[PDB]
Design a protein around this ligand. Structure first.
Ligand code: GTP
Ligand code: GDP
Lengths: 52, 431, 48, 50, 430, 49, 50
């Protein structure tokens, strides 16, 4: 998601392509997740991003 | 030869259907015993649309009366036209639903729905050609709205291509009869959007306003409202039953009316509705009838057309008239009120003319308007449902009927989505 | 000829009933995915 | 906002048409799964008669 | 020996056929029962051994009411019962419904009866297809039948007397849609297509018949008079006999450009009759008046390409030549540079018969002008915007898709009417 | 007699027309195939016209 | 702008899914049409073998 509000809009359908279905199961079961997402930093700051 | 199967559901639906059958039989010259007494060939020419011939000359209406409590059917049978209906078409339970849509859709409707569909299939298979089914009932009630949505879903599953016409009495804006009206309305609208191909919104307070301001009646009982609704329900299909200069069946009306599938809710009004005092003072002309037609007060639905935008509008006229006259009148209306009309549809008029006007009236006309104004009615029902669902008041009676709480969110989401398409096609710009 | 065409049609029908790659298989995959999506949206909307 | 509304309504009515196609597919599947057991029974009778 | 097979499709087609057959029966003296108290009827009727003359017509419709009106009306013993073909479910203003799902069996039975009718004709001048562009039955079933006739019968000349939607006034909502679709269909099948507009005929009735109260019966009566004037040379002899085959060769410059304005003169009530001379010159000028057409299309925007005049009654060739010479010398009338002659005069000695109960007066002279002009592209230009305005949101597209139509069909139809616009532009241009 | 134009520059892509009485040869097979394939590509890509 | 880009991409995706579903529905219609002659053929073979 790109910060967009979904309101009774169907999820992406059956991809029928293996790469896209891998991406979609990743999305469904939260396999890869980065916590901070967007950030902003002053010069020399430290963000401490986490990817799990 | 294109048959229609009528179903009357709930107390309000059963009363409206009984009034409708009284009106139709009187129009076709049928006495309450079923024998023809009209002395007119055209009346019997297409009598098969609503009636079947019995062993003798008796004509049995193709009506199915449905209820959970026997009192409404006892009153209907004791009424003036209660003996025309076949007794096997009276499908009633023993315990009524206490204004519980969950009771009328899950617990008590499940047992009776088998008999209901059995009677429906028996009535439909006898028909040579089936235009479809018309179900008359009221939103905001347990038994009626509940099994009405259930039966509409079942008949949609059985006959996907056949026409579905629904006449739902939406709960009134200002004065509400039962507390659980917004729950029932929200649950029923969810089913009607998905299943009913063509659906009508009617409001009791709009009925009172029109009968008090136009008809100028003093003591309007529910019988008068049922009479007006019956007149509209006859005029919607008089083209099927009588020869017309420019005929239009239910499917033609649906095609010319529904721009997008989910926006199939329509409002009606009937012309000429004249007070007894000013009947002599009025003039029966197409410009008069159209001016009354396009008035907000003539609309049988609470929402006023001025707030919204007319997506489409069909007008089924009845009587000996000029198709030139009618087309000029409605084109002039569109040009004059082009602000209220959607721009990306060059013509918002579906005009049909029938050669047989109703009895007593030299000319008449029914109006079916698909306008974005009904957005405000859906919004008001949402403003009630959301407020009372925020505290889950009387949610628990429905929770007891084996239906999930998530279904209320489902219905609200679908209803407000429909609100969204109404608003956006109201404010949609060409190109 | 009748035996050959009967066998061909019987094989086609039985394969459609039970094949890993059959039009019924794609139909059920699509409809099951649609049902799962609807259930997930509705439960998620209720939770939200 | 105008562009967003345009692309919105396009996406929504395409999705509605997809859902209708899904419903029609369900109806056809039921209508012919009604037929299939007769084929199965006739196959069984065929085998027994051989 | 000069038989012409009549087909009437949809409500408008059948309702104009009612007037057409009333007019032909009155013209040849054929009573409603079927028989009349030489061989001038053979073009429209086939006589049986009993003396009863049955029309060589076919009433095709998917709606039963219109055909049942004929089966019940005064003309129940005249028409052949199997010739009246009735459907079960109406096309519901859906071209896909009338062309893909409902119309198949109906058109098959229609061609069965059409073959039976054509076997009974020694010669066959052609077909007269009367349908309604702007409705599923007329559009879809009419298009399917026209394709079917073009494929099987082949070189028989088919005259399609189509009614297109008026510019501003209309009665349907998907009327631009199905009109574009049926024009897409009939651009390649009909040999000569006659354009009609309800608004224009309404204006004619309002202004010249002084009918403030126009209706479909009057419109259909006027159309029937136009067609009877068109066919008068097949049934009645006269100087400058013009044939059905001669129409297209004298009227169609290029294969696609075969749509035709039709104009009758005079259109005057019995009251206003015998207040004017109604000479040949005056009636010809009235016919060439921009206002007098049965289509809402001003010639002054375009240029005339061909004009076939059919005169009926006491008309002399010097008078027709003098009137047409004055028309040519007139500055308002403008022809294309590449057609110096552009005139096909034909006369007949049979004055137009008047239907009792009608408004048209008994005039000893009549002119039917059928003209190919580049102006007519304007009406297609109107529909080409009416179509794409809705097609931007693709409203009502789901209805057409449901009965086996694809978005490609809509796109191709729009492309085709754009191509027709370009054809009219290039025929107009030098 | 069946007549075709062999010297017409514009009719050369078709090959003179004529009758081409075989069903696969009827009309404009190449043009129809190209147009249908292009429409199919647009529909498969979802590029609405 | 984010909403319009989002809805453009999903409109395209659902249109592609609709086209795929249309092709699948055509294949399914073909297979369902293949069903019903099999019953008659099996019945005829049953009678002959009996
Ligand atoms: N001139 C003229 N036009 C008519 C008349 N009756 C109907 N029409 C036109 O015919 C159009 C539609 O014709 P049809 O397709 O035959 O209508 P239908 O018989 O109900 O068939 P469908 O609408 O396709 O279901 C309408 O838009 C009218 O404008 C008539 O009597 N005279
Ligand atoms: N027009 C009309 N409306 C009615 C009548 N009886 C009840 N209603 C309305 O219908 C609404 C719903 O009631 P209903 O569904 O019939 O109750 P239920 O049968 O127990 O489900 C109520 O708000 C009433 O105002 C009647 O006879 N005529």
């Amino acid at each position: 998601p790109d910060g967009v509000e979904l309101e009774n809009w169907v999820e992406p359908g059956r991809p029928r392509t293996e790469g896209e279905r891998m991406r979609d199961l990743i999305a469904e079961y939260k396999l890869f997740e980065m916590r901070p997402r967007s950030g902003e930093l002053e010069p020399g700051a430290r963000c401490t991003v986490t990817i799990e | 030869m294109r048959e229609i199967v009528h179903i009357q559901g709930g107390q309000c639906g059963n009363q409206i259907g009984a009034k409708f059958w009284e009106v139709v039989s009187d129009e076709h010259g049928i006495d309450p015993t079923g024998t023809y007494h009209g002395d007119s060939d055209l009346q019997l020419e297409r009598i098969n649309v609503y009636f079947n011939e019995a062993t003798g000359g008796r004509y049995v209406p193709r009506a199915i009366l449905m209820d959970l409590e026997p009192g409404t059917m006892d009153s209907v049978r004791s009424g003036p036209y209660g003996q025309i209906f076949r007794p096997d078409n009276f499908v009633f339970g023993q315990t009524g639903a206490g204004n519980n849509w969950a009771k009328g859709h899950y617990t008590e409707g499940a047992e009776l729905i088998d008999s209901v569909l059995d009677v429906v299939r028996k009535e439909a298979e006898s028909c040579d050609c089936l235009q479809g089914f018309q179900v008359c009932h009221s939103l905001g009630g347990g038994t009626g709205s509940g099994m009405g949505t259930l039966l509409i879903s079942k008949i949609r599953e059985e006959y996907p291509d056949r026409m579905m016409l629904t006449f739902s009495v939406v709960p009134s804006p200002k004065v509400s009869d039962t507390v659980v009206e917004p729950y029932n309305a929200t649950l029923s609208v969810h089913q009607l959007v998905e299943n009913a191909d063509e659906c009508m919104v009617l409001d009791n307070e709009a009925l009172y306003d029109i009968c008090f301001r136009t008809l100028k009646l003093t003591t309007p009982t529910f019988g008068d409202l049922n009479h007006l609704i019956s007149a509209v329900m006859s005029g919607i299909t008089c083209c099927l039953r009588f020869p017309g200069q420019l005929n239009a069946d239910l499917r033609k009306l649906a095609v010319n009316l529904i721009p997008f599938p989910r926006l199939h809710f329509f409002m009606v009004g009937f012309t000429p509705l004249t007070s007894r005092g000013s009947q002599q003072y009025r003039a029966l002309t197409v410009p008069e009838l159209t001016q009354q037609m396009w008035d907000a007060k003539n609309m049988m639905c609470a929402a006023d057309p001025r707030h919204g935008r007319y997506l489409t509008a069909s007008a089924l006229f009845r009587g000996r008239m000029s198709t030139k006259e009618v087309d000029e009148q409605m084109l002039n209306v569109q040009n004059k009120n082009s602000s209220y009309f959607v721009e990306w549809i060059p013509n918002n008029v579906k005009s049909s003319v029938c050669d047989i006007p109703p009895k007593g009236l030299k000319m008449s006309a029914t109006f079916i308007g698909n306008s974005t104004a009904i957005q405000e009615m859906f919004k008001r029902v949402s403003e009630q449902f959301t407020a009372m669902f925020r505290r889950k008041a009387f949610l628990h009676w429905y929770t007891g009927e084996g239906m999930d709480e998530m279904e209320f969110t489902e219905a609200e989401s679908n209803m407000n989505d429909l609100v969204s398409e109404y608003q956006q096609y109201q404010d949609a710009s060409a190109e | 000829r009748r035996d050959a065409m009967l066998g061909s049609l019987l094989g086609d029908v039985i394969g459609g009933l039970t094949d890993p790659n059959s039009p019924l298989a794609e139909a059920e995959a699509a409809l099951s995915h649609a049902d799962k999506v609807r259930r997930k949206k509705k439960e998620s909307l209720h939770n939200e | 906002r105008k562009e967003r509304d345009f692309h919105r309504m396009h996406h929504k009515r395409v999705a509605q048409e997809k859902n209708k196609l899904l419903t029609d597919l369900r109806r056809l599947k039921e209508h012919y799964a009604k037929y299939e057991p007769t084929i199965l029974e006739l196959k069984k009778k065929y085998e027994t008669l051989m | 020996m000069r038989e012409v097979i009549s087909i009437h499709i949809g409500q408008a087609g059948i309702q104009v056929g009612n007037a057409c057959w009333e007019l032909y029966c009155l013209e040849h003296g054929i009573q409603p029962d079927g028989q009349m108290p030489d061989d001038a009827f053979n073009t429209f009727f086939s006589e049986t051994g009993a003396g009863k003359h049955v029309p060589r017509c076919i009433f095709l419709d998917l709606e039963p009411t219109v055909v049942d009106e004929v089966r019940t009306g005064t003309y129940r013993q005249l028409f052949h019962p199997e010739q009246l073909i009735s459907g079960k479910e109406d096309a519901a203003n859906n071209f896909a419904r009338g062309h893909y799902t409902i119309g198949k069996e109906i058109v098959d039975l229609a061609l069965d009866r059409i073959r039976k009718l054509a076997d009974n004709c020694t010669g066959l001048q052609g077909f007269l297809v009367f349908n309604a562009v702007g409705g599923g039955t007329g559009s879809g079933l009419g298009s399917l039948l026209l394709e079917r006739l073009s494929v099987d019968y082949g070189k028989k000349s088919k005259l399609g007397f189509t009614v297109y939607p008026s510019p501003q006034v209309s009665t349907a909502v998907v009327e631009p849609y199905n009109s574009v679709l049926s024009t897409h269909s009939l651009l390649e099948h009909t040999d000569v297509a006659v354009m009609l507009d309800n608004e224009a005929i309404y204006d004619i009735c309002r202004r010249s018949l002084d009918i403030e109260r126009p209706t479909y019966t009057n419109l259909n009566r006027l159309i029937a008079q136009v067609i009877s004037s068109l066919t008068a040379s097949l049934r009645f002899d006269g100087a400058l006999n013009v044939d059905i085959t001669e129409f297209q060769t004298n009227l169609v410059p290029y294969p696609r450009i075969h749509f035709m304005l039709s104009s009758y003169a005079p259109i005057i009530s019995a009251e206003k009759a015998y207040h004017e001379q109604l000479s040949v010159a005056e009636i010809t000028n009235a016919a060439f008046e921009p206002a007098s057409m049965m289509v809402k299309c001003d010639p002054r925007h375009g240029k005339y390409m061909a004009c076939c005049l059919m005169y009926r009654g006491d008309v002399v060739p010097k008078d027709v030549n003098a009137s047409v010479a004055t028309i040519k010398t007139k500055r308002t009338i403008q022809f294309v540079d590449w057609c110096p002659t552009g005139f096909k005069c034909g006369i007949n000695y049979q004055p137009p018969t008047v239907v009792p109960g009608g408004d048209l007066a008994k005039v000893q002279r009549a002119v039917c002008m059928i003209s190919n002009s580049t102006a007519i592209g304007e009406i297609f230009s109107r529909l080409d915007h009416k179509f794409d305005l809705m097609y931007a949101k693709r409203a009502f597209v789901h209805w057409y898709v449901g009965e086996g139509m694809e978005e490609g069909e809509f796109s191709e139809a729009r492309e085709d009417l754009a191509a027709l616009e370009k054809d009219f532009e290039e025929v107009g241009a030098e | 007699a069946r007549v075709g134009r062999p010297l017409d520059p514009l009719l050369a892509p078709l090959g003179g027309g004529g009758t081409t009485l075989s069903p696969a040869t009827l009309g404009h097979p190449a043009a129809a195939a190209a147009h249908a394939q292009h429409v199919a590509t647009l529909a498969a890509n979802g590029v609405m016209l």
